[PDB]
Amino acid sequence: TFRRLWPTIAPFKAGLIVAGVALILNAASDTFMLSLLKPLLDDGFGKTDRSVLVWMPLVVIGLMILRGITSYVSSYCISWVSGKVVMTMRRRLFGHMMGMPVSFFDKQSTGTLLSRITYDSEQVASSSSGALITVVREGASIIGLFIMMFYYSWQLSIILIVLAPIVSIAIRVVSKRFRNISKNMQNTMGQVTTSAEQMLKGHKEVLIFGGQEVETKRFDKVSNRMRLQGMKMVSASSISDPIIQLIASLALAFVLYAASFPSVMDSLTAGTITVVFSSMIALMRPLKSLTNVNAQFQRGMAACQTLFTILDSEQEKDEGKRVIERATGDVEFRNVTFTYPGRDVPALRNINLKIPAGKTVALVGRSGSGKSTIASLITRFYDIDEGEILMDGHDLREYTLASLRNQVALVSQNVHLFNDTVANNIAYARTEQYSREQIEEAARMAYAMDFINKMDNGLDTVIGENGVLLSGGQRQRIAIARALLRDSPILILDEATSALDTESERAIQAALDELQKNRTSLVIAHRLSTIEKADEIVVVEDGVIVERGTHNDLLEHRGVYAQLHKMQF
Amino acid sequence: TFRRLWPTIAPFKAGLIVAGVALILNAASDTFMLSLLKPLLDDGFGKTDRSVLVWMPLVVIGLMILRGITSYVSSYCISWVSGKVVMTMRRRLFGHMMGMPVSFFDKQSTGTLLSRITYDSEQVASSSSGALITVVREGASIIGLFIMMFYYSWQLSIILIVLAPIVSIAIRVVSKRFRNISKNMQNTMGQVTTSAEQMLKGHKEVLIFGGQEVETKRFDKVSNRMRLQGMKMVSASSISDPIIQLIASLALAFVLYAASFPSVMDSLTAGTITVVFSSMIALMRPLKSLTNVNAQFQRGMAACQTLFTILDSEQEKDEGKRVIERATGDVEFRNVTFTYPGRDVPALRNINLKIPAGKTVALVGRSGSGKSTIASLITRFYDIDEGEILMDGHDLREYTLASLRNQVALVSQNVHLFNDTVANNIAYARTEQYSREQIEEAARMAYAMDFINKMDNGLDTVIGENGVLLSGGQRQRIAIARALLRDSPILILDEATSALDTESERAIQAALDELQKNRTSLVIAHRLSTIEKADEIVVVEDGVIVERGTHNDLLEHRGVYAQLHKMQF
């Protein structure tokens, strides 16, 4: 559509208008240069002899310096307004995208999300700038050369611009008719091409059944047919150009025939014919851009509209408003049934799993589904389709989402470190609340003090991407140190890295043991040791808890856990 | 590259040379039109004489008629040239692929085989035509304008032509340097965009840790960073334009200054300088196309190389020179091992299957592995990789290809009909051998003559595509009619569809029975009736003939046939 959000661009409009003035001045310079062509021919030339001729190079080079500075300030100011709107738009996009849930980030768009952040975000400003500079400067050009025509030609310019629509409609209708004829022959050329297709398709039957001379003769016939068809359509397309050239030729022949002196015309001709013709041919392309600017503006505002739909999409529904300072209660599921958005099959039927306070619950039965979502529910990345998860005597969703969400800590195989100092990384979002000595102590009991000590600057070294790129195991240590500093009452572990590293498994296991010494813990590890240490074991084949209790009892009762014990070895 | 294809265009050298003289005449017409401004400017308007300005426009329109006829004969003659090159190329190509074995048609390229026959075949001729018109026409243009301003000025011409290379090297070096600048700033811009990429790659950690307030601050920082990078990359790219325009202006100013600074130029008159300026400006384009002629020629001859490698390929293996009039001998496999070319898995292991003369044998397999291609071995569509098949006590490879294909007749549910008459289709490439009365007599016992009897014009009506579009079952009926007339000693039935068409299934089955009533016949079939009628049953699951014997014998012994009997019902 045409609706736009002016207040996005409004505070910087000053830059826009100065850009605008520069553009018209630039256009004026070109117009002035075209005007400067006129005295160079008649007055500033062999009228008498070498007469002056020395105003021309200084004035043209000065005009060209003028055009240069105008282009410079135009580019600088249009870059200013475009970059500022890009800044504001991307800032608001992040602000209103973080609040939005993972429902978009569920592999819906990750590679093209970068298209969203940079490509179209720059493209909308680029297209708006292109349209604005084209409307202002081409329009200034049309006005300039029109006033030059009127000043230099009160008669010839009028008959010329009256003739212009006639020649344009003539060449347009001729081109349309010849293009229609070309399409008519395209149908028939496509037909004989399909005949040739039908011919070759039956290769096998051609070889097995008899000879091939009839095939060659027939293909000779159809080749001649399509050759004559190519003759006809090439002839039509070619003979389109000398006819439109002839129509323009008649238009031109009429323009100079107007110079056949009446009382109306030829009083003032001079050498002005060249400058007016130059004005016309230089007017040819600004009109083309003047008709393309509408398409450019529509494309730009269409990208704007798509980005607006990405923007104004609803955030996470923060209906809950019950604030909690500390979560000393136990985690319990109440027949929770979940359906994965975008997938017909439900991910999880009703489940009544209870995790008592200060206990370790390991989900051995990852099954084909994997059941990472079961931990995600406490994080509320995905909303609860049915059932409730009671928390200290109240529903999880009833609680203020920030309040509950800060209380839970997640550690997995992969943890995206931020491109800041390692000290910032451990105390991200809590730099003011926590202390540097507290971070140092957290690294101390994390049993990864060696890794942080190995850093060249240590506590304040940049750790994220475009840096040292620490090992995935080291990333796990950093995340667990984050968790220990947080002291989150709720703990959840994925622990997909069942592989044993260069003795970092020992330190990582010690870190898990220390973290789970207190506070609730629901772990999704493949580590049989974690199952042994775990107080309670659950397993789900995507439907329900198949086995419940201590792993020895689930080994005694066959069920499904026994097979997991066999494949665990 | 190139070095060939000249003998093909040799007989059309008359077309080449008439087109060339037409093109150079067109270039001379353009040069004359550019020259026509000098009488118009120096004398047409500036001078008090009036008859001169009405002298020239009739010459303008006449020159443009000349341009029109030259363009028309150019297009027509070069169309003759190109159409003939494509004619000869298509004919030689398809005559070659007649001989090229079926192994090439593996479905390696069938959709783009149409590209080979029309698209690239037209591209070679179109590129040759483009190079021929461009080199001759634009070269005549360079020669024409070079002679032109030399004739009109011995001084301004040389001074323009010596500064021109200086302008080109200056703008080239400036553009290249600023382009290298733009490239490295693009790299730095890419760095910050990758920073943004890792920022929003995962917000899940940002969500759970609730660092909403800090992520926006840091994104604002990096957004300002890439805004400044955009400022720098734009400023450089923008300021590249007025600088190169300034160097061009310096050249223009030098030309104007030297036009009358020394007393050597002297007589530039008034309009002649306009002729030189316009000549240079209109020479800029043909030089640009002169640059691209080499790229166009190499593209065309590369398409020619791709076209030629089809031509420069071995035909089907036709080492055999032994001829058979009627192959009354039996057909028998002896440990024949075959593999599909391009497939690593061995398709066919050794088989010792014997098909006695007169008697017919059957093979049924739902998987289709090896069943389809076992037929092709008798037809020698694909050469046997190892082993021998004895026709009349001699190998198939020993026998001549055409002789062997004459003896054997193929029938299948999918038979590509030809775009010729029904009479031509039944006797294809044999209408000279067999009489028209013989064709209708052949149709008589086929018991599918009913459709051709009710047909609009009887036996002579076109039947293939772009025509009647006969039904699939009736296409199979024409396939059977092809077989009765030949009375081939060897018969191979496919019967893949096994479709029960109401009242046409019975006629088709009866015709098949009559056709296979005599002569050696191998029948692939899922029909239990055809299986029962076969004298011997041999079933293959891509490994070996598993069960040999009658259907009752293959049912008493379980093997695999007892399994197929479950879905045969």
UniProtKB/Swiss-Prot annotation, chains A, B:
Alphabetically sorted, this entry's keywords are: ATP-binding, Cell inner membrane, Cell membrane, Lipid transport, Membrane, Nucleotide-binding, Translocase, Transmembrane, Transmembrane helix, Transport
Say what the protein does. Answer: Involved in lipopolysaccharide (LPS) biosynthesis. Translocates lipid A-core from the inner to the outer leaflet of the inner membrane. Transmembrane domains (TMD) form a pore in the inner membrane and the ATP-binding domain (NBD) is responsible for energy generation. Shows ATPase activity. May transport glycerophospholipids. In proteoliposomes, mediates the ATP-dependent flipping of a variety of phospholipid and glycolipid derivatives. May also function as a multidrug transporter.
The residues that cross the membrane are 52-72, 129-151, 156-175, 242-262, 264-284
Tell me the outcome of changing residue 259 to T: Temperature-sensitive. Loss of lipid export to the outer membrane. Significantly decreases ATPase activity at 42 degrees Celsius but not at 30 degrees Celsius
- Keyword DNA-binding listed: no
Report membrane topology: Multi-pass membrane protein
Give an example GO molecular function: lipid binding
GO BP of this protein: lipid translocation; lipid transport; lipopolysaccharide transport; transmembrane transport
What does the UniProt record report as the effect of altering residue 201 to A in this chain?
Does not reduce substrate binding or nucleotide binding, but decreases ATP-dependent extrusion of substrates
Q: Which gene encodes it?
A: msbA
Spell out the note in the miscellaneous section.
In addition to ATP hydrolysis, may utilize another major energy currency in the cell by coupling substrate transport to a transmembrane electrochemical proton gradient. In vitro, MsbA-mediated ethidium efflux is dependent on both the electrochemical proton gradient and ATP hydrolysis.
What EC number(s) are associated with this protein in UniProt?
Answer: 7.5.2.6
Spell out the activity regulation: ATPase activity is stimulated by lipid A, hexaacylated lipid A or Kdo(2)-lipid A. Inhibited by the phosphate analog vanadate.
Q: Which reaction does it catalyse?
A: ATP + H2O + lipid A-core oligosaccharideSide 1 = ADP + phosphate + lipid A-core oligosaccharideSide 2
Task: Cite the PANTHER family for this sequence.
Answer: ATP-BINDING CASSETTE SUB-FAMILY B MEMBER 10, MITOCHONDRIAL, ATP-DEPENDENT PERMEASE MDL1, MITOCHONDRIAL
SUPFAM superfamilies tied to this protein: ABC transporter transmembrane region, P-loop containing nucleoside triphosphate hydrolases
Which leading EC class covers this enzyme?
Answer: translocase
What's an example GO cellular component term for this entry?
MsbA transporter complex
Q: Which protein family is it in?
A: Belongs to the ABC transporter superfamily. Lipid exporter (TC 3.A.1.106) family.
Residue span(s) of domain ABC transmembrane type-1:
16-299
Q: How the protein is affected by changing residue 501 to G? A: Loss of ATPase activity; ATP is still bound
Free-text comment about domains:
In MsbA the ATP-binding domain (NBD) and the transmembrane domain (TMD) are fused.
Question: What happens upon changing residue 500 to P?
Answer: Loss of ATPase activity; ATP is still bound
Annotated residues for binding of ATP = 365-372
Q: What is this protein called?
A: ATP-dependent lipid A-core flippase
Q: Where in the cell is it found?
A: Cell inner membrane
Gene null: resulting phenotype:
Absence of MsbA alone causes accumulation of hexa-acylated lipid A species and glycerophospholipids in the inner membrane.
